[PDB]
Amino acid sequence: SIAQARKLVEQLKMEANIDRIKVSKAAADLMAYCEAHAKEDPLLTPVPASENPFRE
Amino acid sequence: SISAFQAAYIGIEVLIALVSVPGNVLVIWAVKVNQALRDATFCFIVSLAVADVAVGALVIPLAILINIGPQTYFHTCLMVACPVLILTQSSILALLAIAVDRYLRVKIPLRYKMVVTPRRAAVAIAGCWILSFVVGLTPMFGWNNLSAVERAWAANGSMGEPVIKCEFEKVISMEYMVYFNFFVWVLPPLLLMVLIYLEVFYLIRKQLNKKYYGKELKIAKSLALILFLFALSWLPLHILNCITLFCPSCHKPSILTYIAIFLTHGNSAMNPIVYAFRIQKFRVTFLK
Amino acid sequence: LDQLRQEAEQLKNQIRDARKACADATLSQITNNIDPVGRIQMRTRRTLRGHLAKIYAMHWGTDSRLLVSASQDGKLIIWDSYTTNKVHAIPLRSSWVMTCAYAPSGNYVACGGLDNICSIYNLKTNVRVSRELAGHTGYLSCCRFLDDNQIVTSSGDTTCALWDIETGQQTTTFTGHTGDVMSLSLAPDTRLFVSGACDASAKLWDVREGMCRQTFTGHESDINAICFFPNGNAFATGSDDATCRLFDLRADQELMTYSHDNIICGITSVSFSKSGRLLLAGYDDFNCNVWDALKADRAGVLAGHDNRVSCLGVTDDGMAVATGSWDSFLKIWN
Amino acid sequence: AAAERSKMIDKNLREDGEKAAREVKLLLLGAGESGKNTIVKQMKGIVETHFTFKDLHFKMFDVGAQRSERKKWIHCFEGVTAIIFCVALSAYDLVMNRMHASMKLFDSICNNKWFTDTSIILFLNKKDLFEEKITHSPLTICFPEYTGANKYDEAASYIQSKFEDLNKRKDTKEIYTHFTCSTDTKNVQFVFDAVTDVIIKNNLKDCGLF
Ligand SMILES: Nc1scc(-c2cc(C(F)(F)F)cc(C(F)(F)F)c2)c1C(=O)c1ccc(Cl)cc1
Numbered sequence: 022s023i024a025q026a027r028k029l030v031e032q033l034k035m036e037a038n039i040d041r042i043k044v045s046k047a048a049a050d051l052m053a054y055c056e057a058h059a060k061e062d063p064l065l066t067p068v069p070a071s072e073n074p075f076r077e
Numbered sequence: 078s079i080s081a082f083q084a085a086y087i088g089i090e091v092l093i094a095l096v097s098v099p100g101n102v103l104v105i106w107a108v109k110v111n112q113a114l115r116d117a118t119f120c121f122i123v124s125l126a127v128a129d130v131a132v133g134a135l136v137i138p139l140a141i142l143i144n145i146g147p148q149t150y151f152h153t154c155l156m157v158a159c160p161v162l163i164l165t166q167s168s169i170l171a172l173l174a175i176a177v178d179r180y181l182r183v184k185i186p187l188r189y190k191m192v193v194t195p196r197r198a199a200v201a202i203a204g205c206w207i208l209s210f211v212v213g214l215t216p217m218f219g220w221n222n223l224s225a226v227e228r229a230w231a232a233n234g235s236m237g238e239p240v241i242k243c244e245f246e247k248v249i250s251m252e253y254m255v256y257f258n259f260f261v262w263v264l265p266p267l268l269l270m271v272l273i274y275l276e277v278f279y280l281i282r283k284q285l286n287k288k289y290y291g292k293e294l295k296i297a298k299s300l301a302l303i304l305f306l307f308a309l310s311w312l313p314l315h316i317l318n319c320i321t322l323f324c325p326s327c328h329k330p331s332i333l334t335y336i337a338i339f340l341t342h343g344n345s346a347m348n349p350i351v352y353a354f355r356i357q358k359f360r361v362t363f364l365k
Numbered sequence: 366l367d368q369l370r371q372e373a374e375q376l377k378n379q380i381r382d383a384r385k386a387c388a389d390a391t392l393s394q395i396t397n398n399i400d401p402v403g404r405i406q407m408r409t410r411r412t413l414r415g416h417l418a419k420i421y422a423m424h425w426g427t428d429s430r431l432l433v434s435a436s437q438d439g440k441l442i443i444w445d446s447y448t449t450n451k452v453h454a455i456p457l458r459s460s461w462v463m464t465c466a467y468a469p470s471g472n473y474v475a476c477g478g479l480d481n482i483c484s485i486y487n488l489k490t491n492v493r494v495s496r497e498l499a500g501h502t503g504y505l506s507c508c509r510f511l512d513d514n515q516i517v518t519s520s521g522d523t524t525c526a527l528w529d530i531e532t533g534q535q536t537t538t539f540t541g542h543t544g545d546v547m548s549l550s551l552a553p554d555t556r557l558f559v560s561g562a563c564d565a566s567a568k569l570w571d572v573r574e575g576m577c578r579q580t581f582t583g584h585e586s587d588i589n590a591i592c593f594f595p596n597g598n599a600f601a602t603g604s605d606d607a608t609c610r611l612f613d614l615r616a617d618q619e620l621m622t623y624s625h626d627n628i629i630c631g632i633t634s635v636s637f638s639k640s641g642r643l644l645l646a647g648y649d650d651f652n653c654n655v656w657d658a659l660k661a662d663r664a665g666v667l668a669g670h671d672n673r674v675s676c677l678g679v680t681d682d683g684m685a686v687a688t689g690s691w692d693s694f695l696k697i698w699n
Numbered sequence: 700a701a702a703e704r705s706k707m708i709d710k711n712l713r714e715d716g717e718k719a720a721r722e723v724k725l726l727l728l729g730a731g732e733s734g735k736n737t738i739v740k741q742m743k744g745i746v747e748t749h750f751t752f753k754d755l756h757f758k759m760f761d762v763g764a765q766r767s768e769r770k771k772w773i774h775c776f777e778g779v780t781a782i783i784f785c786v787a788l789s790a791y792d793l794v795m796n797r798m799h800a801s802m803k804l805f806d807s808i809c810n811n812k813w814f815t816d817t818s819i820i821l822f823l824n825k826k827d828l829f830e831e832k833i834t835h836s837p838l839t840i841c842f843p844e845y846t847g848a849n850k851y852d853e854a855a856s857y858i859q860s861k862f863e864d865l866n867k868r869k870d871t872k873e874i875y876t877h878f879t880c881s882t883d884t885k886n887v888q889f890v891f892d893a894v895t896d897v898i899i900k901n902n903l904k905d906c907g908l909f
């Protein structure tokens with residue numbers, strides 16, 4: 022049980038030293054992606070019948 | 078001009094119609110909104126429901142139209158009276174088909190679904206409906222009272238086609254309703270259902286003898302209720318037809334004939350509650 | 366054994382403080398101003414009929430037309446979804462399948478399940494098994510093709526593995542989960558993948574270095590499903606606790622929860638639309654709910670199945686979502 | 700054409716899908732050292748054993764190899780005709796007890812969400828090894844509340860009664876208990892008889908009689 026436990030410590034050791042960005046910046050990046058691709062999303066903004074392959 | 082008991086007959090008939098059209102369309106709707114009901118037994122039960130919703134919607138208004146009796150040409154009254162025979166015979170042959178299907182579920186239970194496929198169930202449903210159309214169109218195939226009523230039309234002195242008060246005993250010969258409808262296509266379906274359900278109960282009671290008495294008594298009560306509803310519906314009207322043909326100097330009231338007629342039509346009201354409502358898959362489809 | 370766990374506890378406390386430190390806001394208040402998507406009423410455009418048992422998995426091909434489906438009837442069916450034509454029906458050696466995948470080249474499919482085997486099928490030979498990838502000690506729960514040559518797998522044995530198909534060897538293994546791994550999702554650049562497990566955690570793995578970079582917790586029960594957000598910087602999970610959650614890699618924490626009080630069933634499958642705005646999720650209550658991924662309100666419902674939604678997927682071009690169900694049908698929606 | 704390929708493939712689906720629908724599927728569930736192995740010798744990851752008896756094809760899936768939690772893959776076997784459960788009678792003293800762990804396993808599968816309508820075939824094994832081990836130790840080691848004479852017949856019927864009454868679905872599923880015999884014919888025959896009873900009662904429930 023000790024050997025497994027030491028392996029766990031190294032993983033967190035690695036994870037503790039990483040660079041993190043702020044949620045305010047992180048959330049802005051996701052919203053910026055959604056806005057930039059809104060017109061290329063056929064499920065968000067549906068396309069005319071002829072363009073739609075399944076039911077033209 | 079309707080009579081006193083005639084108004085009560087039409088009231089019981091429209092009451093039977095208002096019970097038979099929504100209950101049978103519920104059975105057809107529950108088949109369509111479920112995929113586990115695509116078996117062979119449920120094809121037979123939706124065939125009975127199609128025949129019985131046609132009885133509740135197209136045999137009730139034609140029977141009331143016959144019983145009121147408007148002044149009508151002869152072939153017009155045949156085309157009114159023959160859909161009554163077509164769709165009611167569809168009901169009887171569908172009941173026999175469910176009994177043969179239940180007999181095959183207990184007799185050959187392991188190789189049932191490799192014998193009774195929905196393809197073979199569909200040609201059996203088509204066979205029952207084609208046979209019912211043959212029986213109901215026999216009184217337009219030339220077996221009808223037309224010869225007797227035309228001789229009375231010639232004896233009256235009128236010329237051309239006979240126009241009559243459209244009743245059922247006037248256009249359909251009682252030799253058809255006794256020798257061909259009852260003794261061939263009503264009574265041997267009733268005798269076959271009695272023999273099949275006796276053998277179904279013997280095979281069930283043999284398997285359950287291989288807490289069990291209660292299930293066996295419930296099965297016997299279910300089978301006896303089904304046979305009693307068919308007998309109480311279809312035997313009074315046809316005993317009266319046999320009385321009419323065999324004793325002609327033999328009186329019976331008209332209220333007795335009216336009582337027997339709606340018993341025949343109210344078979345189709347009690348069909349979704351003793352055939353489809355007994356299935357657990359149908360009940361969990363009804364409440365959802 | 367005493368010192369290590371106390372030392373680990375300090376590490377857990379430090380990560381929590383660090384995660385909170387950069388939580389200067391919540392996604393909900395940042396996104397409050399944008400217009401709501403509104404009601405979405407996707408209609409069934411195709412019903413794919415022909416399976417004769419429960420469907421457990423499906424995967425769109427990268428050409429957005431072909432799709433593969435896996436069912437407990439022992440059949441792997443490839444459908445031309447535009448015409449409803451079946452392109453191939455592949456007979457499976459074991460019918461107890463839980464996952465399938467379509468290779469991006471279109472040259473291969475993969476399938477596996479309770480046989481503990483990932484079988485690779487060459488579609489461009491009839492179709493025959495070219496490889497059976499053996500070595501997992503629990504059921505195969507998921508598999509995804511980096512390319513034709515390489516396929517990452519997930520397993521009930523609590524590990525994930527990278528396989529070289531030509532040589533048949535596990536070339537990289539991914540250990541560290543403490544419960545059955547149920548689902549994995551490849552990043553768009555295929556250098557990272559995330560896995561979801563029955564220890565209620567998600568882990569981000571780097572394929573070529575072979576170890577866990579980050580671990581994401583927060584769910585209260587098993588994670589049945591996981592999918593990357595399309596830009597590869599976030600992902601969503603679906604759980605038996607009736608919630609979905611969005612996790613951000615760079616902020617290393619949960620950003621949003623997607624749940625309704627009148628939703629109490631488990632989630633079996635999740636996928637994003639092409640722009641990331643919609644998060645579609647399949648539920649044990651026989652319905653698919655469509656969430657606005659930025660504002661967490663439910664935008665719509667897809668109610669067209671008579672049993673559990675077990676799988677779903679959105680095309681690479683974004684044009685359609687397919688839903689697969691235990692009721693033996695697939696439906697195409699847009 | 701493509702619709703010709705679609706229709707040829709759809710024909711093979713209906714053909715092979717009804718050919719695999721006339722085959723009885725029997726999930727085999729048991730505890731460690733409970734006699735699962737002995738049954739599969741008699742009749743012939745997940746291992747599937749296929750035998751044909753009296754023109755009936757039986758597929759028996761031994762899924763005991765899997766060490767993963769049952770709740771993640773037990774819904775794949777929702778459509779099995781019956782469940783064959785193997786219990787070691789001799790293991791009422793062995794090891795938190797082996798019979799108490801086997802009863803907890805039995806009471807979990809029986810009262811599952813997926814197995815409500817599926818009958819369970821119960822097999823009790825090592826009744827010969829039970830006959831000597833019942834004199835070296837009473838059943839008070841296993842069941843403290845037991846108050847019966849230390850003979851095989853009453854005790855076996857008491858252990859069978861303990862296994863049975865854990866069925867909360869007393870209306871919808873039936874437990875068929877058979878003590879495994881040294882005769883190869885007899886054990887397979889009981890399975891066929893139990894499956895036939897299950898198939899007949901399933902047919903009766905689709906009529907509406909049962
Ligand atoms: N063919 C059969 S076999 C049993 C009955 C039956 C009779 C009565 C009666 F009042 F006439 F005695 C009541 C009922 C019940 F359904 F209302 F209980 C059924 C019938 C009918 O013709 C019938 C009459 C009226 C209605 Cl609505 C429905 C059916």
Ligand SMILES: Nc1ncnc2c1ncn2[C@@H]1O[C@H](CO)[C@@H](O)[C@H]1O
Pocket residue numbers: 140161162165166245246254258314318334338341342
């Ligand atoms: N004597 C009769 N009078 C009126 N209708 C009858 C008679 N005999 C049979 N029928 C009709 O035949 C149908 C059954 O074949 C009944 O529903 C009823 O309409």
